[PDB]
């Protein structure tokens, strides 16, 4: 009980995201007739996530040339908004007073290649955010983390932990 011993006694001993058929009775009736080899009335798709990757009904190749700015050039022998930073009024104007219509067709495709890459990057990010919630939903996790349990339940195994004799 003395404080020379109390400090040493404890020292010596320390002691809307999927696109399946959500009805859980038409999927079973589909397989019950599919094993026979029969169609059914309703439709059933495979499971997936929602969302459409719709290109070419979106950002197009721009039209930097006029209706005849190439054939007339043929006769006369010639920070970011989406992916490109907005240029100042005076600095870009002398830059576009330098170029030639041999490079206008280059510039159109360069700017289209920037636009399509940004429009694929953001949709790719949204798609990864959707698949990370698909895989959690299909594995029993809710999101973002009389019943009878089967032996394949978390904590309901049949192989009980056997204890060693010294314990």
């Amino acid at each position: 009980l003395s404080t020379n011993l109390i400090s040493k006694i404890s020292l010596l001993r320390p002691s809307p995201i999927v696109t399946e058929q959500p009805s859980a009775e038409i999927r079973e009736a589909y397989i019950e007739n599919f094993a026979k080899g029969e169609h059914i009335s309703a439709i059933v798709p495979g499971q997936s996530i929602s969302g459409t990757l719709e290109l070419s009904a979106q950002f197009r190749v721009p039209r930097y040339h006029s209706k005849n700015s190439f054939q007339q050039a043929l006769q006369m022998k010639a920070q970011y908004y989406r992916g490109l930073p907005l240029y100042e009024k005076n600095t870009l104007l002398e830059r576009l007073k330098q170029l030639t219509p041999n490079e206008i067709k280059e510039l159109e495709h360069l700017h289209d290649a920037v636009f399509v890459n940004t429009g694929l990057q953001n949709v790719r990010k949204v798609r990864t955010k959707k698949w990370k919630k698909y895989w959690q939903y299909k594995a029993g996790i809710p999101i973002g983390l009389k019943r009878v349990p089967n032996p394949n339940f978390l904590g309901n195994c049949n192989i009980k932990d056997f204890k060693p004799p010294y314990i």
């Binding site: 009389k146 019943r147 009878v148 349990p149 089967n150």
Partner: peptide, 5 residues
């Protein structure tokens, strides 16, 4: 398994 009463 859903053993009900």
């Amino acid at each position: 398994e859903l053993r009900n009463t």
